[PDB]
Design an enzyme around this catalytic site. Structure first.
Site, short mmCIF file in Angstrom:
data_model
loop_
_atom_site.label_atom_id
_atom_site.label_comp_id
_atom_site.label_asym_id
_atom_site.label_seq_id
_atom_site.Cartn_x
_atom_site.Cartn_y
_atom_site.Cartn_z
CG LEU A 1 48.44 32.81 23.52
CD1 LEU A 1 47.62 34.08 23.46
CD2 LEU A 1 47.87 31.80 22.50
CE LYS B 1 36.41 33.99 33.34
NZ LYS B 1 35.22 33.15 33.49
CG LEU C 1 64.49 32.70 21.38
CD1 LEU C 1 64.67 34.17 21.69
CD2 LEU C 1 65.74 31.96 21.82
CB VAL D 1 44.68 33.85 28.80
CG1 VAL D 1 43.42 34.17 29.68
CG2 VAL D 1 44.49 34.33 27.37
C1 LIG Z 1 49.83 36.98 9.76
C2 LIG Z 1 50.03 37.00 11.26
C3 LIG Z 1 49.24 35.92 12.01
C4 LIG Z 1 49.63 36.11 13.49
C5 LIG Z 1 49.06 35.06 14.44
C6 LIG Z 1 49.34 33.62 14.10
C7 LIG Z 1 48.49 32.68 14.97
C8 LIG Z 1 49.07 32.53 16.40
C9 LIG Z 1 48.37 31.47 17.30
C10 LIG Z 1 48.88 31.52 18.74
C11 LIG Z 1 50.24 30.83 18.82
C12 LIG Z 1 50.70 30.81 20.28
C13 LIG Z 1 52.12 30.25 20.42
C14 LIG Z 1 52.43 30.05 21.91
O1 LIG Z 1 52.74 31.10 22.54
S1 LIG Z 1 52.35 28.51 22.68
C15 LIG Z 1 52.27 28.80 24.44
C16 LIG Z 1 50.80 29.08 24.79
N1 LIG Z 1 50.79 29.57 26.20
C17 LIG Z 1 50.57 28.80 27.28
O2 LIG Z 1 50.31 27.61 27.17
C18 LIG Z 1 50.57 29.46 28.66
C19 LIG Z 1 49.49 28.83 29.56
N2 LIG Z 1 48.17 28.83 28.91
C20 LIG Z 1 47.40 29.90 28.65
O3 LIG Z 1 47.78 31.02 28.98
C21 LIG Z 1 46.03 29.70 27.99
O4 LIG Z 1 45.50 28.37 28.28
C22 LIG Z 1 46.06 29.91 26.46
C23 LIG Z 1 46.36 31.37 26.13
C24 LIG Z 1 47.07 29.04 25.70
C25 LIG Z 1 44.68 29.59 25.87
O5 LIG Z 1 43.71 30.42 26.51
P1 LIG Z 1 42.49 29.73 27.32
O6 LIG Z 1 42.90 28.38 27.77
O7 LIG Z 1 41.97 30.74 28.30
O8 LIG Z 1 41.39 29.47 26.18
P2 LIG Z 1 40.42 30.55 25.47
O9 LIG Z 1 39.03 30.17 25.91
O10 LIG Z 1 40.95 31.92 25.69
O11 LIG Z 1 40.64 30.11 23.96
C26 LIG Z 1 40.24 28.84 23.48
C27 LIG Z 1 40.85 28.70 22.11
O12 LIG Z 1 42.30 28.86 22.11
C28 LIG Z 1 42.91 27.73 21.43
N3 LIG Z 1 44.24 27.47 22.04
C29 LIG Z 1 44.54 26.87 23.23
N4 LIG Z 1 45.89 26.92 23.39
C30 LIG Z 1 46.42 27.50 22.27
C31 LIG Z 1 47.72 27.77 21.81
N5 LIG Z 1 48.83 27.51 22.54
N6 LIG Z 1 47.89 28.40 20.62
C32 LIG Z 1 46.84 28.75 19.85
N7 LIG Z 1 45.59 28.43 20.20
C33 LIG Z 1 45.36 27.81 21.42
C34 LIG Z 1 41.94 26.57 21.69
O13 LIG Z 1 42.22 25.50 20.77
C35 LIG Z 1 40.61 27.31 21.56
O14 LIG Z 1 40.18 27.53 20.22
P3 LIG Z 1 39.11 26.50 19.55
O15 LIG Z 1 39.74 25.09 19.62
O16 LIG Z 1 37.76 26.76 20.31
O17 LIG Z 1 39.17 26.75 17.99
#
Ligand SMILES: CCCCCCCCCCCCCC(=O)SCCNC(=O)CCNC(=O)[C@H](O)C(C)(C)COP(=O)(O)OP(=O)(O)OC[C@H]1O[C@@H](n2cnc3c(N)ncnc32)[C@H](O)[C@@H]1OP(=O)(O)O
Ligand SMILES: COC(=O)c1ccc(N2CCCCCC2)c(NS(=O)(=O)c2ccc(OC)cc2)c1
Length: 411
Positions: free
Chosen positions: A159, A168, A411, A161
């Site tokens: 994941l 955003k 991984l 962004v």
């Molecule tokens: C049945 C199948 C289901 C399939 C899916 C299962 C679910 C999978 C879930 C994903 C598993 C990922 C596993 C990995 O890959 S973990 C590695 C995550 N990647 C990174 O850390 C790379 C650097 N960071 C970024 O690219 C961004 O900061 C990310 C993308 C992390 C957040 O983007 P951004 O900073 O621009 O924020 P927003 O405004 O768009 O979004 C804000 C919301 O996002 C929530 N947030 C922040 N970080 C994470 C995180 N690591 N997992 C889940 N949620 C996270 C946060 O609490 C908030 O929600 P809320 O608190 O307002 O409620």
């Protein structure tokens, strides 16, 4: 407060989590036909994109997004630099579902702005042993056992962004659209990890590292020479002495894993992973995909005695970008992957991992305290890092377990 995660079928508090007694679904039973046929709506300047993992130019696009924008440590000292070859490996295991790899591009120029990847995993994720005992004590055996069979679910990773698009709310959109694609496939659980606290983990563990090239490590981060070493006459020579390793493996009978080892590796790995509450099940094809050696990606060695494989280890390569350095912009890290020991003490098996890694130019060996990784920390001179990796399910109630009851390597 959590405007997205509050809406999702995950445990919402630690209090809620402590209360969980059986493994099972959180959400309403749903059916594929209930799920929207079409992609979740997104702004007219954005478009959904399903990268073709067989296209070098699509893998390259994902590669660069993650090289510039993926996971950094708390102090921004490093950022993961997963390689193209690694990504093709990790994203394309046997029976992978291309539709599970979800991207957003800017419509006008096709700039990749965001990405999330799901792959299949067959996971044992029934009620942990300590809770099963408690269940037998209540008469509640059957309920506790309902969900013991390995389940074919989704493993989420990567994941990301773009830094320009942060905060955003683009990430919830990616997760919703990934959840839709997986649901349309009649899969309703996922497993994922993060180095950040979210609602709500079923397990958490520290990171542990082992210096292989201390000269190069001081030159970046390790705060130069580790503080405790400054206090003597020649710190660097003392440091090198501390971490020095033999030139060749100690275990005679150690050799690289080959295709014909696949059945035997599968057997000793599966037997070993049964002792853990949560863990993967691999077919022959999956053992071959994840453990057969691939240059610059994954490295796997077996101890063969009397023409029989009795032990094995594996490690994978993730370089990191060293965020502000000159002499040294790359950190070459080897991560402990699957292993199994039956003829020797684990520390003796893993000492050869470190020897092989060092011999092949790795700077450090890294791991989370999952599996039985704690059993060789002290003897092999691993030290805790500042990281914690939290393990999560989506749509799965699960009691808290120790990291030493987790057998899924992320991984
Ligand atoms: C049945 C199948 C289901 C399939 C899916 C299962 C679910 C999978 C879930 C994903 C598993 C990922 C596993 C990995 O890959 S973990 C590695 C995550 N990647 C990174 O850390 C790379 C650097 N960071 C970024 O690219 C961004 O900061 C990310 C993308 C992390 C957040 O983007 P951004 O900073 O621009 O924020 P927003 O405004 O768009 O979004 C804000 C919301 O996002 C929530 N947030 C922040 N970080 C994470 C995180 N690591 N997992 C889940 N949620 C996270 C946060 O609490 C908030 O929600 P809320 O608190 O307002 O409620
Ligand atoms: C994005 O993280 C990296 O690329 C990285 C690389 C190497 C790490 N260590 C830190 C100690 C000295 C340098 C080598 C081993 C560390 N330290 S770490 O403590 O292993 C760590 C790993 C992942 C993580 O995810 C948010 C946070 C901390 C991190």
């Amino acid at each position: 407060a959590h405007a997205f995660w509050s809406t999702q079928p995950v445990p919402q508090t630690e209090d809620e989590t402590e209360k969980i007694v059986f493994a099972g679904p959180m959400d309403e039973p749903k059916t594929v036909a209930d799920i929207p046929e079409e992609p979740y709506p997104i702004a007219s300047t954005f478009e959904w994109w399903t990268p073709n993992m067989e296209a070098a130019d699509d893998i390259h696009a994902i590669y660069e997004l993650l090289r510039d924008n993926y996971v950094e440590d708390d102090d921004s000292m490093f950022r993961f630099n997963y390689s193209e070859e690694f990504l093709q490996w990790a994203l394309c295991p046997p029976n992978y579902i291309p539709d599970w790899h979800v991207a957003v591009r800017r419509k006008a120029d096709k700039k990749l702005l965001a990405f999330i990847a799901g792959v299949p995993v067959t996971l044992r994720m029934g009620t942990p042993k300590y809770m099963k005992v408690k269940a037998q004590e209540k008469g509640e055996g059957e309920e506790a056992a309902k969900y013991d069979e390995p389940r074919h679910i989704c493993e989420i990773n990567f994941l990301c962004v773009h830094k320009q698009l942060r905060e955003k709310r683009l990430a919830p959109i990616l997760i919703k659209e990934a959840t839709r694609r997986v649901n349309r496939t009649n899969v309703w659980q996922a497993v994922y990890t993060a180095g950040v606290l979210l609602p709500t983990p079923y397990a958490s563990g520290q990171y542990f590292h082992r210096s292989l090239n201390p000269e190069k490590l001081v030159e970046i981060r390790f705060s130069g020479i580790p503080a405790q070493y400054q206090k003597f006459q020649n710190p660097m020579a003392m440091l090198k002495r501390n971490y020095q390793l033999p030139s060749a493996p100690k275990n005679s009978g150690l050799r690289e894993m080959k295709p014909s080892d696949v059945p035997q590796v599968r057997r000793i790995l599966m037997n070993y992973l049964d002792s853990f509450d949560v863990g993967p099940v691999f077919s022959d094809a999956e053992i071959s995909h994840y453990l057969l050696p691939r240059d610059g990606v994954v490295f796997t060695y077996v101890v063969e005695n009397d023409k029989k494989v009795t032990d094995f280890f594996s490690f994978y390569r993730i370089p990191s970008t060293v965020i502000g350095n000159s002499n040294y912009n790359l950190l070459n890290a080897a991560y402990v992957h699957y292993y199994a020991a039956t003829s020797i003490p684990l520390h003796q098996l893993i000492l050869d991992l470190l020897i092989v890694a060092h011999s092949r130019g790795f700077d450090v060996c890294n791991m989370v305290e999952i599996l039985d990784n704690r059993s060789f920390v002290e003897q092999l001179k691993f030290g805790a890092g500042d990281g914690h990796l939290r393990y999560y399910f989506y749509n799965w109630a699960y009691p808290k377990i120790k990291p030493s009851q987790v057998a899924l390597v992320m991984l």
